[PDB]
Every structure is written in structure tokens, then in C-alpha cells.
């Protein structure tokens, strides 16, 4: 399944697209593939930040844990 709601994600994607380029429409299948990819990326990042929190002798993940996970992974953070 898809954990993120379809219509809000569509709206956000259209917002960022209109920021980049105007009158650049997306297919439903392209939006579905992009949403699947983003959900996979988010669940992977949450797995990594859960590993970070477990490493810090804790059970509740924090924003600094996600920051550390993204800094170690190699993203722009």
C-alpha cells in the first residue's frame, strides 16, 4: 500500500513543480511512481534514524538522529 495520502502529495508535487517549471503536467502513473520512491526513501531514512537512536541508548528517535543519519548517508545535511 501507500502510507502517504495521494491528493496532498499530488498538491505538494505540483507546487514544487510550478516552482521549477510552469504548465509541466504529470501523469497519474508518474506521480504514483514518485510517491512510491519517496515513501521508500522515507521509510529507509526512518530505519536509519531508528538505528541511530538505538545506538544512543534510547528508544525515541529525535530530529538530531535524522540529522546524523542524513549526514552519514551522504545527503546535503
Amino acid at each position: 500500500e501507500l502510507l502517504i495520502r495521494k491528493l496532498p502529495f499530488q498538491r505538494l508535487v505540483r507546487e514544487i513543480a510550478q516552482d521549477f517549471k510552469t504548465d509541466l503536467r504529470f501523469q497519474s502513473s508518474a506521480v504514483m511512481a514518485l510517491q512510491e520512491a519517496c515513501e521508500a526513501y522515507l521509510v529507509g531514512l526512518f530505519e536509519d534514524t531508528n538505528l541511530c537512536a538505538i545506538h544512543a541508548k534510547r528508544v525515541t528517535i529525535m530530529p538530531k538522529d535524522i540529522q546524523l543519519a542524513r549526514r552519514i548517508r551522504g545527503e546535503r545535511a
Binding site: L3, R5, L12, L42, V43, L45, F46, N50
Partner: peptide, 19 residues
């Protein structure tokens, strides 16, 4: 539009117990 319960669900799928 990516609401709090949706993000919670994503974290649950990621194996997170407390958020």
C-alpha cells in the same frame, strides 16, 4: 498535506517505536 499520522505510519513501517 503530509499529515502527522501519515508520518507516524511511515515511521512505524520503518520500525520506530517512539517518536
Amino acid at each position: 498535506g503530509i499529515t502527522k499520522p501519515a508520518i507516524r505510519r511511515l515511521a512505524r513501517r520503518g520500525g520506530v517505536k517512539r517518536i
